[PDB]
Symmetry: C3
């Protein structure tokens, strides 16, 4: 009852869905880039898009297209690499779907169905950018962006909030109430630390007036929540603050979930600046203190990832954006950054490498003269070698 | 009296001007894409650009360059495929020029001269995006955008209007007065149906306050004109309306001229949304009622064409835009969409295919949860097959 | 004391740093384009970026990255082609560095250190787009943009000014006070003519309210300065003025330093227009009068260079921008235009070619009808040949 191109297409998918990934000539001493993305719109199973019944669909047309899969939460569940990816269909709404692999640089395959998540309100128009936390309390939390319309004359005006839901398998989800932030009407780039702080749940947040425009409101705020089941945040202490003429000028916020090291919380975050061609996103790093995570103790100058070569172009071009990372027990680190809001790539590093960077890469000299002196010094002691 | 590179360049043109076009591996069950565009700036004849006289131009330089040819009206005149293309020169003004072929996917060649069209006013700065209607009244109408300056401090501020002119050969044009819309100071994406409605001329329009910003003013309005020779439209009834978080959020409007089918008027239109990198244009479809063309009876969720691969980049990137289509007698359909305001491509479909899409592709579920359920159902009945 | 990838990387650089450049099939009768850029971020010496000491940098990571090198002043010092390039690091600040060659289309190599330039104030955040003038007074002046923050709530709000500094070798620089313009709070695209005018120093300027938005304020103004050591400009006489629906609509300004010919000052300048995808920059030309440089005597319609093929994409895409040019004694001309604020290319022409263009390429007909007639006439006298 098939229609018979299906067999052939299903055959080409499998070839892509198993396509071997290779490392690129790219070097900087910190991470490695790879030739192919780990997830594309081509990766979504065809029976999520096509109706294979020959009677109600005779030409064999795509009934529900996928436009993009990007910004993806990452977590290692048991011994499989799990990517809770943001999948965007042709209708512009995004939803979550899990993809699994055993190598982390290739072989990712979506599950049987996409992720089901109870709407709390009925004006929840779409959800995105989930960050995954394997907390010490036993659960796995997904904290994600919830976008609703503002009832205004401007059809484009929408309000953003932060929603929380818990799982243990990634199939079943318990939708907890949305996080409340009392000194901030909207929230973006919210994420939960894997450990308690003063016997409470710890968040990184971005307070803001709403919703394209950051408020006052300098950057990434640290907040404590008494109970996650009814999460409330009265204060948000400032950590990474945006600075004029840095990589953070217009915006900045958390990316991958905080990663615990012996020297502190490694936050692979993102910064936004305004350019003549629109907004430019890049991926930078910063380390906060283990016993005091509101305290930035490492913060290099500039960025770690920027759009590079064919990463430059997509639906929202000159954007790189990480939602999540995977840390192996031996020291291996996998960073899942999307490019141009169209595809998901992988960058490979280690804890010691990523810690070498941030403590030892020089902080921002902030002004051209001091920057020149800063570079001159390095040149001056590289020549006092040969 | 030649200068003698001309012979060689004229020889390479002919090779491009006759270059065979091939179909691409692209599939979705609805249309086919092709390897090469049907018209580029390279297609314009060199004696429109170069002065071949060796005395007044010794280095053989280009005196009047072409920067782009895009958004093109389409009509089958006699048995030739005719493309009234928008040609933009280096001086940023656009004008119309006709290109003809007998295959429709290749071999397009411009005429002897470009299209001459009487300015009605003397502050008509430029004209563009003509839609061609072979009306039942005998004539062929070109309804197009007329752009004038607003006498304001902002040099960029301009007013848009809709101009009409009739022909039978595409060489000679009778400029009729500009369409008047009384409940709307400006007009874009205006087009004329091939049949009468209540013994009158039928338009699709986009009412608007002006001119980058849509007013109130929800979308594509249907209007009746008593006489085309002095065209007046008092009311515009709303058809396709823009919706929050759809493909239409910021803007939307007509594309190719309405195409009559047995089930209704097939309108291949366009939608615009705001992104961090600027505005994104896509091509979608909707069907209105034969006896009541203000009544949308089919309207799928999402789009039909979006910028794809090297279509992504040009002078105004991430734009696809159709001005016109060509329908053969047997059922063949040719859609002429431009990419990034630089080149004109072709998409090949049929009436029954394009009708399968729009009636049977699911309408917009509007919110992520309902979208997920909508996709889940399809997945659930594709598995109840194998 | 080396770490030993360095030797290998240093070996690949040398191959790029010596890579032969070839001419492209590109033709228009005026300039030639080349296959490779003359300067990239790959061109910067690795000991400006890497710490080769194995003890303080064990993984051999890049400590001070380069994100781009673009908009470059050009001057022939003795018999070497010198490019004072704008180098941008990962921290978003720009600085100047000199690169030298003997062919001008290839083989460019940076100096030992980057350019040292005394900050006059301590809130000078960054400097860029230096134009180089070998004046008749003996010196070489660099007039460049100085960007400071405005002490406002908007972190993005910055004020621009024009700074001057003199040299004879390009290593040592005497920072003179910033140019004062009394009828204009900010200045961009300022440059100095190589000759005196009425026994004074002659500037082209762009007066402006600040700083993304041009004021009133029509375009490129000519100004006279009594003494360069304390440079003051009371009046700026208008030359090239921006016009609605031209290549100059939103912005325009000087590019390469004025080039003296027998028929006038050849100014290879730039124009900016607003598009749905952001701002579009192109390179155009105009000639002013030798004894009266505020008087435009040649000004063709449109542009000379626009973003082409892979020039289209970078950090600020659809931008071409020249800072400087090199004129040989025999008639050879080298134009150093950057693309998309990422790389620096070269266009090759001659004085007589570039003079043929501007006097003989038709001026702007300003409106579509007159443009069509203008092109029609040329077509009409190209056919009255064969």
């Amino acid at each position: 009852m098939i229609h018979e191109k299906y067999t052939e297409m299903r055959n080409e998918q499998e070839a892509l869905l198993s396509r071997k990934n290779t490392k690129t000539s790219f070097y900087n001493g910190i991470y490695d880039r790879y030739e192919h993305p780990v997830l594309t719109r081509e990766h979504i199973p065809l029976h999520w898009r096509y109706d294979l019944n020959k009677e109600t669909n005779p030409f064999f047309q795509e009934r529900l297209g996928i436009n993009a899969v990007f910004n993806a939460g990452a977590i290692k569940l048991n011994d499989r690499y799990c990517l809770v990816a943001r999948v965007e269909g042709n209708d512009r709404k995004s939803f979550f779907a899990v993809a699994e692999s055993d190598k982390g640089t290739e072989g990712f395959r979506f599950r049987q169905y996409p992720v089901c998540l109870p709407a709390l309100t009925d004006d929840e128009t779409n959800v995105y950018d989930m960050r995954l936390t394997q907390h010490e309390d036993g659960w796995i939390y997904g904290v994600f962006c919830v976008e609703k319309s503002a009832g205004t004359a401007d059809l484009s005006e929408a309000v953003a909030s932060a929603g929380i839901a818990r799982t243990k398998d990634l199939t079943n989800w318990e939708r907890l109430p949305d996080l409340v932030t009392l000194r901030s009407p909207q929230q973006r780039n919210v994420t939960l630390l894997p450990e308690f702080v003063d016997g409470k749940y710890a968040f990184y947040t971005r307070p803001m007036d709403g919703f394209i425009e950051t408020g006052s409101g300098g950057g990434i705020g640290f907040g404590l929540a008494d109970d996650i089941t009814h999460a409330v945040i009265d204060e948000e202490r400032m950590t990474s603050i945006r600075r004029y003429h840095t990589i953070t000028e217009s915006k900045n916020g958390a990316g991958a979930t905080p990663i615990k090291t012996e020297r502190g919380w490694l936050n692979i975050a993102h910064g936004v600046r305004n350019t003549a061609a629109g907004l430019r996103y890049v991926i930078y790093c910063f380390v906060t203190d283990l016993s005091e995570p509101w305290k930035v103790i490492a913060e290099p100058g500039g960025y770690l990832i920027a759009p590079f070569k064919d990463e430059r172009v997509g639906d929202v071009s000159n954007v790189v954006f990480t939602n999540g990372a995977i840390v192996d027990d031996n020291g291996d680190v996998y960073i899942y950054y999307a490019s141009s809001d169209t595809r998901l790539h992988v960058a490979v590093s280690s804890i010691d490498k990523l810690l070498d960077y941030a403590f030892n890469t020089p902080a921002d000299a902030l002004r051209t003269a001091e920057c020149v002196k800063q570079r001159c010094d390095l040149i001056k002691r590289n020549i006092e070698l040969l």
